[PDB]
């Protein structure tokens, strides 16, 4: 069907008024729109994209680290096995590091070489893609990060309506900006965002990017394809074969992102991207306060546990911060958070009572203001409140955190561990009891 090649939801902006118009925010966060392309966004806000040009970046922090992916330059929208015999999902994406200065040299020489060639199945050429460049440090990137505060609030890296702001600590590349330096064919293979959070991406130019998008509710189909092909959906590099998707009745949105266009990837939307020209991009995540965002983040948090993959977003910590600090006025979102908090509380009460009944001391440890969430040093599951720390790490005050299961596996009666408690039961109960639905007429 042509239902399988649907039009891209698109907003055409001319000025600041259009950027700040509330129906824009509502359109982006509507779960029926898997992606929204906001055309002309940089022009409409007079955003200086020159602050993100390769020349500017080299002048600012020439030795800054760049993760390099070395990839094959594949034709059009296809991915061929290295022999050029058949189309397959697995893609070659070998990893190394470089600096902004060194990648910039390659990006520029790549272009000059193409000019020279223009003045003249595979085998394919190799290219390098500069990815995951960390723009978190405000003392290194002051002017760059300041420019992004010109965005409307809903798309900012930091805002009161962004769940990632309510985490209360840094999650690199999610509530901090990542930069991408590209040459033609540079590919970001198929993925959903970490914990299914929305993503914001602005193309710096001067070249274009081509995007491929599949709605969230088809992700199981793509997971199945990965498994049938010996690939890990979450952890492997794959580039979908569009003919497979079409055969499976999976709709694919496909579009070009020009310099100054902002791409809003909605919660859980599956996507893969390739540079058509030479360009840089910037991106980060946002978490709208909607039932849909929270539900999908929780779902992926739980799926990640089943797949033994770390969740970058500590959904337990976050849920407590929401209850402590956010007046929630949507009944559906409210009931979800409340439901999660009750599960957390009851599991905590069950575990704490079992420890005490076995005669294990629970040590009052408290918490430093703004301390990040903890994850198990062995299995990387989030660990909330009750921390299992070895007698030796306790003595040394390194406080190396384990979950209960990992501690028990090591030490059958927890004889090798102390149990540290960061929050009093009565204090968590009060937060839960006082978390009630606020009235909004909106
Ligand atoms: O620009 C890229 O290659 C990264 C795109 C992406 O995955 C995102 O913005 O979420
Ligand atoms: Fe992405
Ligand atoms: Zn563990």
Author numbering: 880 to 999, 1023 to 1344
Original paper wording:
KDM6A (UTX) and KDM6B (JMJD3) are KDM6 subfamily members that catalyze demethylation of Nϵ-methylated histone 3 lysine 27 (H3K27), a mark important for transcriptional repression. Despite reports stating that UTY(KDM6C) is inactive as a KDM, we demonstrate by biochemical studies, employing MS and NMR, that UTY(KDM6C) is an active KDM. Crystallographic analyses reveal that the UTY(KDM6C) active site is highly conserved with those of KDM6B and KDM6A. UTY(KDM6C) catalyzes demethylation of H3K27 peptides in vitro, analogously to KDM6B and KDM6A, but with reduced activity, due to point substitutions involved in substrate binding.
The first helix in KDM6A and the linker region (residues 886–902 in KDM6A) that connects the helical and JmjC domains are not observed in our current crystal structure of UTY(KDM6C). The UTY(KDM6C) JmjC domain contains 13 β-strands and 10 helices, including the extended and distorted double-stranded β-helix that is characteristic of the 2OG oxygenase superfamily. At the active site, the nature of coordination by the metal binding residues is also well conserved, with metal binding by the Nϵ-imidazole nitrogens of His1093 and His1173 and by the carboxylate of Glu1095. Analysis of the electron density at the active site supports presence of 2OG in the cofactor binding pocket. 2OG coordinates the active site metal in a bidentate manner via its oxalyl group, with a water-ligated coordination site adjacent to the predicted location of the substrate Nϵ-methylated lysine group (as observed in KDM6B and KDM6A enzyme-substrate complexes). Notably, the unusual (within structurally characterized 2OG oxygenases) presence of two cysteinyl residues (Cys1111 and Cys1181) in the 2OG binding pocket is observed in UTY(KDM6C) as in other KDM6 subfamily members. In each of the KDM6 subfamily members' zinc-binding domains, the Zn(II) is coordinated by four cysteines, Cys1278, Cys1281, Cys1305, and Cys1308, in UTY(KDM6C). Comparison of the structures reveals that the Fe(II)/2OG binding sites are highly conserved in all human KDM6 members. Superposition of the three structures implies that most of the hydrogen-bonding interactions in KDM6A/B substrate binding probably occur in UTY(KDM6C). Notably, however, one residue, located in the loop between the JmjC and helical domains and which in KDM6A (Ile1267) and KDM6B (Ile1511) appears to form hydrophobic interactions with Ala25 of the H3K27Me3 substrate, is substituted for a prolyl residue (Pro1214) in UTY(KDM6C) (see below).
